[model samples]
Target: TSSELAKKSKEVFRKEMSQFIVQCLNPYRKPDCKVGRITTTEDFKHLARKLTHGVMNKELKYCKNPEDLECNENVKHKTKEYIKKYMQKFGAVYKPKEDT
Candidate 1:
């Protein structure tokens, strides 16, 4: 039934989401990276948003060539939009870092 399918889907979503959050919080097996302890879902949400923003703004490693940069710009825009939509849907909030 549709209800059963929806229940199964939600389970899968939760499992995948939890795994993804854990990975983001602890990509390294050891506590060698920043974001040592992800205390809450909000923290995860903020980190996720910051990651997407960094990629989009070219603050992170990105394309070097003109053509590649052009293509990546569109890709980053779409990725950022998707992240924003997901956060909105899930009621997640993130404060972007201020430029130093």
Candidate 2:
């Protein structure tokens, strides 16, 4: 039972973690007017990926917000601790309401 629970919990945890990450990094994108564009979920997702992965050409030596791309060993270790603390209460059961 413990193994099954852990596996299910991990799935939920990963989903929550991804959503948390997306929310945190979404704000770095330019506003729709600034880019002569309209905001959309796809646009936000693209922006989040770019921030998380850093620039494509590898020009930036240091990240302006290191948390965006600092998932090295130390960050990984710390992320576990942080996730443990965060998920203690929530336990990763989240969903958006849908209507058809």
Top-TM-score structure, candidate number: 2
Query: Candidate 2 at residue 53, lDDT?
Result: 36
lDDT of each: 0.42, 0.38
Residue 93, model 1: lDDT of 25
Per-residue lDDT tens digits of candidate 1, residues 1-100?
5456545643453344334434544532233423233335666666654544444356224643223322134554555455444334332223233211
With candidate 2 superimposed using the best TM-score fit, by how many Å does residue 20's alpha carbon deviate from the native? 0.7
The alpha-carbon deviation from the true structure for residue 31 of candidate 2, after best TM-score superposition, in angstroms, is 4.3
RMSD (Å) of each candidate, 1 decimal = 13.2, 15.5
Residue 44, model 1: Cα distance from true site in angstroms? 10
lDDT digits (tens) for residues 1-100 of candidate 2:
5456545644454444445546453432335322212145665565334333332113124433322333444434444444333323322221111100
Candidate 1, residue 29: lDDT:
25
Error of 1 at 56 (Å): 24
